[PDB]
Amino acid sequence: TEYKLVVVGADGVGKSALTIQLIQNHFVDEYDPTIEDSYRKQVVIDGETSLLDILDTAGQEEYSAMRDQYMRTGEGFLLVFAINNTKSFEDIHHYREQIKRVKDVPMVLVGNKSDLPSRTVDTKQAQDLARSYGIPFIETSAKTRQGVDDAFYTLVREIRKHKEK
Protein backbone atom coordinates (compact mmCIF):
# COMPACT_ATOMS: atom_id res chain seq x y z
CA THR A 1 0.00 0.00 0.00
CA GLU A 2 1.33 3.42 -0.99
CA TYR A 3 0.15 6.88 0.17
CA LYS A 4 1.03 10.05 -1.81
CA LEU A 5 1.36 12.76 0.89
CA VAL A 6 2.00 16.41 0.10
CA VAL A 7 3.35 18.98 2.50
CA VAL A 8 2.10 22.55 1.85
CA GLY A 9 2.24 25.95 3.51
CA ALA A 10 4.13 29.22 3.52
CA ASP A 11 7.94 29.65 3.11
CA GLY A 12 9.89 28.92 6.27
CA VAL A 13 7.15 27.15 8.27
CA GLY A 14 9.20 23.93 8.45
CA LYS A 15 7.88 21.79 5.56
CA SER A 16 11.35 20.55 4.67
CA ALA A 17 12.42 20.10 8.33
CA LEU A 18 9.24 18.08 9.03
CA THR A 19 9.83 15.89 5.96
CA ILE A 20 13.48 15.27 6.81
CA GLN A 21 12.55 14.47 10.46
CA LEU A 22 10.14 11.79 9.25
CA ILE A 23 12.55 10.36 6.64
CA GLN A 24 15.91 10.64 8.48
CA ASN A 25 15.13 11.26 12.14
CA HIS A 26 17.32 14.36 12.16
CA PHE A 27 16.62 18.09 12.39
CA VAL A 28 17.86 20.05 9.38
CA ASP A 29 18.74 23.71 9.96
CA GLU A 30 19.27 24.97 6.41
CA TYR A 31 17.45 22.87 3.80
CA ASP A 32 17.51 24.84 0.50
CA PRO A 33 14.33 26.96 0.63
CA THR A 34 13.68 26.84 -3.11
CA ILE A 35 13.85 23.05 -3.55
CA GLU A 36 10.74 20.93 -4.10
CA ASP A 37 11.48 17.20 -3.77
CA SER A 38 9.89 13.84 -2.94
CA TYR A 39 11.04 11.11 -0.55
CA ARG A 40 9.80 7.61 0.26
CA LYS A 41 9.60 5.97 3.67
CA GLN A 42 8.28 2.51 4.58
CA VAL A 43 6.38 2.56 7.88
CA VAL A 44 3.96 0.32 9.79
CA ILE A 45 0.82 2.25 10.92
CA ASP A 46 -1.93 0.43 12.83
CA GLY A 47 -0.33 -2.87 11.80
CA GLU A 48 -0.33 -2.06 8.09
CA THR A 49 2.95 -1.79 6.18
CA SER A 50 2.73 1.49 4.20
CA LEU A 51 5.04 3.25 1.67
CA LEU A 52 4.70 6.99 2.23
CA ASP A 53 5.66 9.11 -0.75
CA ILE A 54 6.15 12.63 0.67
CA LEU A 55 6.23 15.66 -1.61
CA ASP A 56 7.83 18.59 0.19
CA THR A 57 6.61 21.65 -1.79
CA ALA A 58 8.68 24.77 -2.61
CA GLY A 59 9.50 27.14 -5.49
CA GLN A 60 7.99 30.11 -7.17
CA GLU A 61 4.28 30.71 -6.77
CA GLU A 62 3.06 29.55 -10.15
CA TYR A 63 -0.13 27.97 -11.37
CA SER A 64 -0.03 25.91 -14.49
CA ALA A 65 -2.23 23.04 -15.71
CA MET A 66 0.93 20.87 -15.16
CA ARG A 67 1.33 21.94 -11.50
CA ASP A 68 -2.47 21.48 -10.93
CA GLN A 69 -2.24 17.90 -12.27
CA TYR A 70 0.88 17.26 -10.18
CA MET A 71 -0.92 18.48 -7.02
CA ARG A 72 -4.08 16.52 -7.90
CA THR A 73 -1.98 13.27 -7.54
CA GLY A 74 -1.61 13.92 -3.79
CA GLU A 75 -3.98 11.75 -1.73
CA GLY A 76 -3.48 13.61 1.57
CA PHE A 77 -2.12 17.03 2.46
CA LEU A 78 -0.42 18.47 5.52
CA LEU A 79 -1.41 22.19 5.87
CA VAL A 80 1.62 23.52 7.70
CA PHE A 81 1.90 26.90 9.45
CA ALA A 82 4.43 28.07 12.08
CA ILE A 83 3.01 29.08 15.49
CA ASN A 84 5.29 32.16 15.55
CA ASN A 85 4.12 33.44 12.09
CA THR A 86 0.60 34.77 11.87
CA LYS A 87 0.78 35.29 8.09
CA SER A 88 1.56 31.52 7.63
CA PHE A 89 -1.57 30.72 9.63
CA GLU A 90 -3.70 33.23 7.64
CA ASP A 91 -2.44 31.61 4.39
CA ILE A 92 -3.83 28.15 5.35
CA HIS A 93 -7.23 29.00 3.74
CA HIS A 94 -5.38 29.57 0.42
CA TYR A 95 -3.63 26.15 0.51
CA ARG A 96 -6.83 24.31 1.46
CA GLU A 97 -8.76 26.01 -1.36
CA GLN A 98 -6.01 25.26 -3.92
CA ILE A 99 -6.15 21.57 -2.99
CA LYS A 100 -9.99 21.52 -3.20
CA ARG A 101 -9.76 23.40 -6.55
CA VAL A 102 -7.49 20.81 -8.23
CA LYS A 103 -9.12 17.75 -6.63
CA ASP A 104 -13.66 15.59 0.91
CA VAL A 105 -9.87 15.63 0.60
CA PRO A 106 -7.77 14.12 3.44
CA MET A 107 -5.92 16.91 5.24
CA VAL A 108 -4.29 17.61 8.61
CA LEU A 109 -3.60 21.09 10.02
CA VAL A 110 -0.04 21.22 11.44
CA GLY A 111 1.14 23.99 13.79
CA ASN A 112 4.91 23.66 13.60
CA LYS A 113 7.74 25.24 15.65
CA SER A 114 5.91 24.31 18.90
CA ASP A 115 9.28 24.38 20.75
CA LEU A 116 9.62 28.20 20.26
CA PRO A 117 8.56 30.60 23.04
CA SER A 118 7.63 33.38 20.57
CA ARG A 119 4.10 32.13 19.81
CA THR A 120 1.77 34.47 17.87
CA VAL A 121 -0.96 31.93 16.90
CA ASP A 122 -2.75 30.37 19.87
CA THR A 123 -3.75 26.68 20.03
CA LYS A 124 -7.45 27.54 20.24
CA GLN A 125 -7.39 29.58 16.96
CA ALA A 126 -5.82 26.60 15.19
CA GLN A 127 -8.20 24.08 16.84
CA ASP A 128 -11.14 26.25 15.75
CA LEU A 129 -9.79 26.47 12.15
CA ALA A 130 -9.30 22.66 11.96
CA ARG A 131 -12.80 22.14 13.39
CA SER A 132 -14.29 24.44 10.69
CA TYR A 133 -12.57 22.20 8.06
CA GLY A 134 -13.55 18.89 9.81
CA ILE A 135 -9.87 17.88 10.02
CA PRO A 136 -7.39 17.07 12.80
CA PHE A 137 -4.95 19.63 14.23
CA ILE A 138 -1.50 18.39 15.33
CA GLU A 139 1.12 20.60 17.09
CA THR A 140 4.66 19.70 15.97
CA SER A 141 8.26 20.66 16.32
CA ALA A 142 10.61 19.47 13.60
CA LYS A 143 13.40 20.48 16.07
CA THR A 144 12.47 18.18 18.99
CA ARG A 145 10.38 15.77 16.81
CA GLN A 146 7.27 16.43 18.96
CA GLY A 147 4.16 15.38 16.97
CA VAL A 148 6.06 14.56 13.73
CA ASP A 149 5.01 10.90 13.44
CA ASP A 150 1.54 11.82 14.70
CA ALA A 151 1.04 14.41 11.94
CA PHE A 152 2.05 12.02 9.11
CA TYR A 153 0.33 8.96 10.60
CA THR A 154 -2.90 10.92 11.30
CA LEU A 155 -2.85 11.94 7.62
CA VAL A 156 -2.57 8.27 6.59
CA ARG A 157 -5.52 7.46 8.89
CA GLU A 158 -7.56 10.25 7.22
CA ILE A 159 -6.73 8.77 3.78
CA ARG A 160 -7.84 5.28 4.98
CA LYS A 161 -11.09 6.81 6.30
CA HIS A 162 -11.72 8.51 2.95
CA LYS A 163 -11.08 5.23 1.04
CA GLU A 164 -13.79 3.55 3.15
CA LYS A 165 -16.45 6.05 1.98
Contacting residues toward ligand GDP, per CB under 6 A: 11-17, 29, 31, 33, 58, 112-113, 115-116, 141-143
Give Cβ neighbours of residue 60 (< 8 Å, ≥ 6 apart).
none
Task: Determine if 30 is a binding residue for ligand A1I9E (CB under 6 A).
Answer: no
Interface with Mg ion (CB under 5 A), residue from 8, 16, 74, 83 = 16
- Rounded least distance, CB 67 to ligand GDP, Å: 17
Binding residues for Mg ion, total number by CB under 5 A: 3
Task: Determine if 94 is a binding residue for ligand A1I9E (CB under 6 A).
Answer: yes
**C-beta of 45 vs 155, nearer to ligand A1I9E:** 155
164: phi then psi, degrees, rounded to nearest 5: -75, -25
Return d(Cα 13, Cα 8) in angstroms, integer: 9
- Rounded least distance, CB 134 to ligand GDP, Å: 25
Return d(Cα 125, Cα 131) in angstroms, integer: 10
Return d(Cα 11, Cα 155) in angstroms, integer: 21
Return d(Cα 65, Cα 146) in angstroms, integer: 37
Interacting span for Mg ion (CB under 5 A) from 39-47, 52-60, 105-113, 146-154: 52-60
Task: Determine if 23 is a binding residue for Mg ion (CB under 5 A).
Answer: no
Q: Where are the alpha helices (DSSP H) in the chain?
A: 15-24, 65-72, 86-90, 92-102, 123-133, 148-164
| Eight-class DSSP state of 4 | E
User: Which residue's CB comes closest to Mg ion?
Assistant: 16
Q: Which of Mg ion, ligand GDP, ligand A1I9E, none is residue 142 near (CB under 5 to 8 Å by kind)?
A: ligand GDP
**C-beta of 31 vs 133, nearer to Mg ion:** 31
